[PDB]
Ligand binder design. Structure first.
Ligand code: RQZ
Ligand code: PHU
Length: 290
């Protein structure tokens, strides 16, 4: 089913919200008897020309990816007046990894966190082979399919690299989650697969702190930023990073995983390991742990 008849998408609730977009939980119920499959459905509201263009791109990217570790595209449906599309995807009832880690902390061991690390890395390896920069990778937009299975979601900011170039540049984002971004992204608006590796090291930090709010990247920054408190965060963060300061090793985090983090956060993009180099190292550590 490539086209989902709007009439059969039964609205249930909202799942989540960005500025320009929402995701809704719907049942696709073509028998009309409320027995059909749940789906997540994304649509724009309150968006300009660039946001609409960016959404058709989002759709095309997700539709082309077939990975166990990337949230699955199902189809499209029509929005109001059949003047717009909605992006129909599989529904993962366990929600985002960030919140799952906080709720289930007590029973998720290092081996399970290594499994999630390995799965995310594999997904990113898959993206990388399709010249896709995710950009937004964070625990808050990774989804839990089952207790032993996660998937990368939220392709709102994803972009394909041209055949002939290994990065792109944007106009200064008005607002971005600065504590996940590589320094070249913060300072020169450069994004690449290697800037995704930086963000992945911050994902490893998220995983091995169980996304505890007390040692969040923001909380660590405020601890680290120093005595001068009226200094703009982004300005101060870039200085800290330039000086070689990095998020600290979580108390419980295996030393080898911390070492991977530090490699991910190499100052020079070309000095960071690729996802294909990270994957076997994480796989080895996960294997070790079960
Ligand atoms: C954890 C906080 C948060 O933002 N969670 C969130 C936001 C938006 C959507 C979801 C969600 C939950 N289950 C889903 N299944 C699939 C998809 C999808 N295909 O994009 C999104 C889902 C959770
Ligand atoms: N990658 C990395 O270490 N980022 C960072 C550093 C200090 C505070 C907050 C985030």
């Amino acid at each position: 089913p490539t086209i989902f008849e709007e009439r059969h998408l039964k609205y249930i609730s909202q799942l989540g919200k960005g500025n320009f977009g929402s995701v809704e939980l719907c049942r696709y119920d073509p028998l009309g008897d409320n027995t059909g499959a749940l789906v997540a459905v994304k649509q724009l509201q309150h968006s300009g020309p660039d946001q609409q263009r960016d959404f058709q791109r989002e759709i095309q990217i997700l539709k082309a990816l077939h990975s166990d570790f990337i949230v699955k595209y199902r189809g499209v449906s029509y929005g109001p007046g059949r003047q717009s599309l909605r992006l129909v995807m599989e529904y993962l009832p366990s929600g985002c990894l960030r919140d799952f880690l906080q709720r289930h902390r007590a029973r998720l061991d290092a081996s399970r966190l290594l499994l999630y690390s390995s799965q995310i890395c594999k997904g990113m390896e898959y993206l990388g082979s399709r010249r896709c920069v995710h950009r937004a990778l964070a625990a808050r937009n990774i989804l839990v399919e089952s207790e032993a299975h996660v998937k990368i979601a939220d392709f709102g900011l994803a972009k394909l690299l041209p055949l002939d170039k290994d990065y792109y540049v944007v106009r200064e984002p008005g607002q971005s989650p600065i504590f996940w971004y590589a320094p070249e992204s913060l300072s020169d608006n450069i994004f690449s697969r290697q800037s995704d590796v930086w963000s992945f090291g911050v994902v490893l930090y998220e995983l091995f702190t169980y996304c505890d709010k007390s040692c969040s990247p923001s909380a660590e920054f405020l601890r680290m930023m120093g005595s001068e408190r009226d200094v703009p965060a982004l300005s101060r963060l870039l200085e800290l990073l330039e000086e070689g300061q990095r998020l600290p090793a979580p108390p419980a985090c295996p030393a080898e995983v911390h070492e991977l983090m530090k490699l991910c956060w190499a100052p020079s993009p070309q000095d960071r390991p690729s996802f294909s180099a990270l994957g076997p190292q994480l796989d080895m550590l996960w294997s070790g742990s079960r």
